[PDB]
Design a protein around this ligand. Structure first.
Ligand code: GSH
Ligand code: GSH
Ligand code: ZN
Ligand code: ZN
Lengths: 217, 217
């Protein structure tokens, strides 16, 4: 079956996992354990990084038979294409492309300060700007059931992940955007999504690696 | 005609520009000037950031009639889809997806240290690792004329940009990979690309913004 390599954490593999489950894909997981500080030993991965036959060795990676893939968004499109979740109309594809990258940006913005030793200092400013960021997603979604349009796409997994990570960071952050909350309900309401969230496989934390100042555990 | 907003620099708009020219697309450019230090006044853009009707106000952006787009990779796919340069076969799309993101990573890696005030100190390490990064691209391309396969795709523009930025940073960097040099020859060898490189429109520098430590001018 398919095999998804990644750290023994949520991180970037989250949306993928969620996607794999929703698509009822058959897959295994090669979770890599990172050593404790101050070393943060990553040999478990490095002693296999270049033996998997990946073109650009990295985490996460996906191995589907002869197909060795890296880069989260690439892995998602790969899985999505097999289930027509990459968009169909012209406008659908545009929205998918924009979000695919937008979420990636917002995700890093968060991860940047969370990995920053001076995290406690930067937090006040980040929170001040967050409402605006969230608002943007709200404006974008509008009265649509999903982000791409009427049909769910892989970007809905990416958007969810981001929004979830934020209700976790600042719980009240979503209160001002009812439609976004409905999105989360609607998303977590999906059959296979709900079932998986209740299974032993569900790994919502640690949000980041051990090197993080926040969500490291 | 189409309109491409961005800073009065190379940056992320480079590959786009290159793509637009090769596609013989009709377009204008809304270059935004950033103020000198220590303020780096960005008012010229901020006083118009939210009036363009962009979903996620950002630079670069592309306006094609009713279509307002942001996110470099999104803009590229938009332009590419109009000219069938987004890939066709399954393997083609995979490669496109991987590179589309890989290049973005390598580009930031460069941009990160060049914007880092302690640039001179980090440089030795970055150069030590670069050969391997380059090697990967070499390994990937192989005997193929283009990265996606036999046909040129928008990623060849993204890969070129990255490679170019590095021969500029470290000229001898490519000497060890002849196939990558042939790629640059073959790319700058394209009729519309060559013509554009010789026109008044060509803007190879500044590589980055004024806030940069390297390639700021
Ligand atoms: N754009 C890449 C970024 C991947 C990346 O930097 N992954 C980090 C984890 S978030 C990693 O630990 N990679 C393993 C390594 O650097 O060897 C993606 O989406 O896969
Ligand atoms: N992932 C984005 C990066 C966008 C970005 O941060 N662009 C810079 C220049 S490289 C910018 O000036 N953005 C305007 C802003 O965020 O105000 C893309 O490819 O569009
Ligand atoms: Zn990470
Ligand atoms: Zn930039």
């Amino acid at each position: 079956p398919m095999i998804l390599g990644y750290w023994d954490i949520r991180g970037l593999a989250h949306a993928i996992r969620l996607l794999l489950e929703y698509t009822d894909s058959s897959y295994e997981e090669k979770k890599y354990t990172m050593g404790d500080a101050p070393d943060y030993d990553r040999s478990q991965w490095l002693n296999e990084k270049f033996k998997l036959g990946l073109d650009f060795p990295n985490l996460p990676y996906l191995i589907d038979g002869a197909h060795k893939i890296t880069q989260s968004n690439a892995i998602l499109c790969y899985i999505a294409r097999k289930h027509n979740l990459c968009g169909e109309t012209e406008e659908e594809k545009i929205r998918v492309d924009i979000l695919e990258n937008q979420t990636m940006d917002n995700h890093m913005q968060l991860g940047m300060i969370c990995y920053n030793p001076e995290f406690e200092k930067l937090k006040p400013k980040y929170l001040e700007e967050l409402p605006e960021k969230l608002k943007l997603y709200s404006e974008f979604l509008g009265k649509r059931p999903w982000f791409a349009g009427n049909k769910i796409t892989f970007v809905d997994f990416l958007v969810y992940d981001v929004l979830d990570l934020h209700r976790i960071f600042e719980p009240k952050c979503l209160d001002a955007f009812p439609n976004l909350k409905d999105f989360i309900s609607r998303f977590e309401g999906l059959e296979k999504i709900s079932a998986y969230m209740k299974s032993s496989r569900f790994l919502p934390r640690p949000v980041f690696s051990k090197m993080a100042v926040w969500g490291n555990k």
